[PDB]
Amino acid sequence: KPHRYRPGTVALREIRRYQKSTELLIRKLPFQRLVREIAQDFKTDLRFQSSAVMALQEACEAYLVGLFEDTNLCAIHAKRVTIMPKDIQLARRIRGERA
Amino acid sequence: PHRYRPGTVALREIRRYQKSTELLIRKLPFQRLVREIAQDFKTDLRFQSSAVMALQEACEAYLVGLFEDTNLCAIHAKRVTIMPKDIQLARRIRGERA
Amino acid sequence: RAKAKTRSSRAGLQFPVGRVHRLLRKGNYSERVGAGAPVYLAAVLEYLTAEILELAGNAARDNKKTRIIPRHLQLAIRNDEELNKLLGRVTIAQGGVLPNIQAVLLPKK
Amino acid sequence: RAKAKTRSSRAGLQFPVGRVHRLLRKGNYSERVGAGAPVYLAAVLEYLTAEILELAGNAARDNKKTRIIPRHLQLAIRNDEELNKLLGRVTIAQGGVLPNIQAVLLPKKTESHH
Amino acid sequence: RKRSRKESYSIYVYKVLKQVHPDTGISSKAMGIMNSFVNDIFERIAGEASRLAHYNKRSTITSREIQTAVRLLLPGELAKHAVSEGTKAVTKYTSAK
Amino acid sequence: KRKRSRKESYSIYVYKVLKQVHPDTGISSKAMGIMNSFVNDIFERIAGEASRLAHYNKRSTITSREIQTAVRLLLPGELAKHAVSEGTKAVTKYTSAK
Amino acid sequence: AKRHRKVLRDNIQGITKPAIRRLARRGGVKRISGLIYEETRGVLKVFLENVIRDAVTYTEHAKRKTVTAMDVVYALKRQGRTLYGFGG
Amino acid sequence: KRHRKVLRDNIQGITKPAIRRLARRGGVKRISGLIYEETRGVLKVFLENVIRDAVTYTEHAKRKTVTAMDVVYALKRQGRTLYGFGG
Numbered sequence A: 001k002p003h004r005y006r007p008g009t010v011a012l013r014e015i016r017r018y019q020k021s022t023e024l025l026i027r028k029l030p031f032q033r034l035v036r037e038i039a040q041d042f043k044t045d046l047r048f049q050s051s052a053v054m055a056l057q058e059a060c061e062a063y064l065v066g067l068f069e070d071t072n073l074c075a076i077h078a079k080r081v082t083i084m085p086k087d088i089q090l091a092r093r094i095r096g097e098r099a
Numbered sequence B: 001p002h003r004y005r006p007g008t009v010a011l012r013e014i015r016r017y018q019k020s021t022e023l024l025i026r027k028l029p030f031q032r033l034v035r036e037i038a039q040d041f042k043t044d045l046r047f048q049s050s051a052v053m054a055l056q057e058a059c060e061a062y063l064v065g066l067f068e069d070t071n072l073c074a075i076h077a078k079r080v081t082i083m084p085k086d087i088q089l090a091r092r093i094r095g096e097r098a
Numbered sequence C: 001r002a003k004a005k006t007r008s009s010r011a012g013l014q015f016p017v018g019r020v021h022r023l024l025r026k027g028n029y030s031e032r033v034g035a036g037a038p039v040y041l042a043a044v045l046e047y048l049t050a051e052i053l054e055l056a057g058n059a060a061r062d063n064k065k066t067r068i069i070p071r072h073l074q075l076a077i078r079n080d081e082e083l084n085k086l087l088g089r090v091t092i093a094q095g096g097v098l099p100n101i102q103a104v105l106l107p108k109k
Numbered sequence D: 001r002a003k004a005k006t007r008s009s010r011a012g013l014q015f016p017v018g019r020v021h022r023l024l025r026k027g028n029y030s031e032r033v034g035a036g037a038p039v040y041l042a043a044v045l046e047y048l049t050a051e052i053l054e055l056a057g058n059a060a061r062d063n064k065k066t067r068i069i070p071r072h073l074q075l076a077i078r079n080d081e082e083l084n085k086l087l088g089r090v091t092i093a094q095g096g097v098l099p100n101i102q103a104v105l106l107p108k109k110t111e112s113h114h
Numbered sequence E: 001r002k003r004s005r006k007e008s009y010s011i012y013v014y015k016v017l018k019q020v021h022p023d024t025g026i027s028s029k030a031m032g033i034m035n036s037f038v039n040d041i042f043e044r045i046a047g048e049a050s051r052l053a054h055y056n057k058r059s060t061i062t063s064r065e066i067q068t069a070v071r072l073l074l075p076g077e078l079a080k081h082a083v084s085e086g087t088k089a090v091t092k093y094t095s096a097k
Numbered sequence F: 001k002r003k004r005s006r007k008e009s010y011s012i013y014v015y016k017v018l019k020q021v022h023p024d025t026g027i028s029s030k031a032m033g034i035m036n037s038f039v040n041d042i043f044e045r046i047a048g049e050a051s052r053l054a055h056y057n058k059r060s061t062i063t064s065r066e067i068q069t070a071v072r073l074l075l076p077g078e079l080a081k082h083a084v085s086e087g088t089k090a091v092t093k094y095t096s097a098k
Numbered sequence G: 001a002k003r004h005r006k007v008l009r010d011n012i013q014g015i016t017k018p019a020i021r022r023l024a025r026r027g028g029v030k031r032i033s034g035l036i037y038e039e040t041r042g043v044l045k046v047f048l049e050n051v052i053r054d055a056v057t058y059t060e061h062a063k064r065k066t067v068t069a070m071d072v073v074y075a076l077k078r079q080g081r082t083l084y085g086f087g088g
Numbered sequence H: 001k002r003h004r005k006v007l008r009d010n011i012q013g014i015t016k017p018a019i020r021r022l023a024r025r026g027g028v029k030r031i032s033g034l035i036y037e038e039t040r041g042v043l044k045v046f047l048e049n050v051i052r053d054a055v056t057y058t059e060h061a062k063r064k065t066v067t068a069m070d071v072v073y074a075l076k077r078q079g080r081t082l083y084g085f086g087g
């Protein structure tokens, strides 16, 4: 008797929720650390303007959201509904990001 | 009596044409097309012969590359045959198409 | 001495012809710059600017908002066939995406 | 009075430091061009040219051919992971493509050659 | 100490906004986006113009270059209105002198 | 008229470098055309980015340091190391000649 | 008298099936659905329009009536299909 | 003092539910468990290429701080032009 939504229905609901919005979807501090981690590998003791870290995050999430759209088309192309890493790898190969 | 199985002469042709560098579209038809497409931009246009070659070189390169990408989409859907949706998905993902 | 009129005012333009003209001379595009150029360029910059704000404004109105914000610009651009092409490799911060859910992913009812 | 020493010889280059320096000044890049800019640049162009020529020359030699042709340049470039990336949105007229047939398209049976 | 001058297109975006939607306003973030746009396209047109003039062995970017640059860079209908509005503005600026 | 105008190229140089690298191999005109396109392509990329750099940092001057930073930006890993190396060596040698 | 040029129509069909197959072969295609050939023609035509448009634009800016290999080379660069061996 | 920067393995801070949200905006309905790690690697490669160029722009300017313009110029070079942070 307790209410339960069939699988797909809360997912479809999330899609709508997030397509309506523009908030960044990666949590800010984790992101900010990762950037600095990665930045060490090229130069030591670098500071960032916070707008520089926001500009990167804006740019990343935009690229990933974009890549997911192409990944979803590749998944559907093969008569599926479930994105899998070969979808991502195909998208990026056709995109020419990858060999 | 003698006959090859389907796909055998196809593979043979793949080997043949990847080994060579000659243009594969026939030159005069290609030229006629260029002239025709050009007419919708400016009447009574002339063409350096190298400019037509330069456009054929480009086209053929563009298409050969598109077919490579098209094949991968076919194979991704567990197919050996290319179909228009494979060309469309490639072109969608390349940014050429909406 | 005659009175100062701006070149924008002479062109019936809101964009700064004089500034554009200086940006052209100082941006390493050519040794010389004709006086028609910045007038024409500032013109086009004004047209496209106006085009986007026409469409961005309508989206702010549909959203019951007095002020244009990035999402309104993004909706304006991504629903207009030509503006989208013009900006097809451009990311608009804080814009989001157009609502799109492939048909196949919807319920059968 | 005492004359005639070409900047390229000074730098130890075949590429023309003076042509390169002219091309920078006249090419709407910056108001001024410093004296190392064309030396450095010419050198880099010489380096990349010499790589491709080395590799393509090898390709022509494997072909039992005295002369480099576009295909020798293509084969050189597309089998060098790095040159391929530098020149990956570039089309070499008359180069063709590298031999390559996806495995799912082959037949699978092995029974072999002499 | 007064901050050093960062120019922008923001007084001109507003002026156009009042022409087009007298009741409507604009946030900082939107202005930043408008301003990025204007600079983007400035550079695209000016760039293609620089090439055009250089390809044709000429020292001078004129309106004829800006126009042909516009033709090459903007899509059909957008190109047409730009060319019209750019011609208007010149033809007009000429008659005033 | 009577004599066609002069159109510059990097041919003599490409050839000079060719004799260094392979003394007994030649080069067809199409192949040389590709080499000339190559040099001009890259010239334009490196000068281009050097141009941005200077402008982005309010310098009027493209110096050997802008070429270097641009070279680091445009070439991939190994190619850029050797490229910066040869660029560094050449400027060095050139100041020694004085 | 003297007469200027005349109209050409549906030359796209001169891009035949064998040649479309050959191109696909070089692209490593083994099996081709029969709807490909008309799709490929569509795609090829869009490519040529976009490149010829831009080339011809360069022509008219040089106040010429002859389209030159450089007009094509410059157009293809703008399209991000930079081509080597025709005047780069 | 000077407070060293501890490389904590933050790529794992890019959580599963975050990756799932990004995919919802992208219109993805269903997600293989293999996705979340594939993505992280895809993200890392993205971040390295942008941050390398950005930091190159920083170095050439003789600055110790990466600015938002360094990042913008970087994304322009990588063909991923961003509006709203200057330029």
Ligand SMILES: [Ca+2]
Pocket: E020, E021
């Ligand atoms: Ca209105």
Ligand SMILES: [Cl-]
Pocket: C033, C034, C035, C036, C037, E061, E062, E063, E064
């Ligand atoms: Cl003018």
Ligand SMILES: [Cl-]
Pocket: D034, D035, D036, D037, F062, F063, F064, F065
């Ligand atoms: Cl210098």
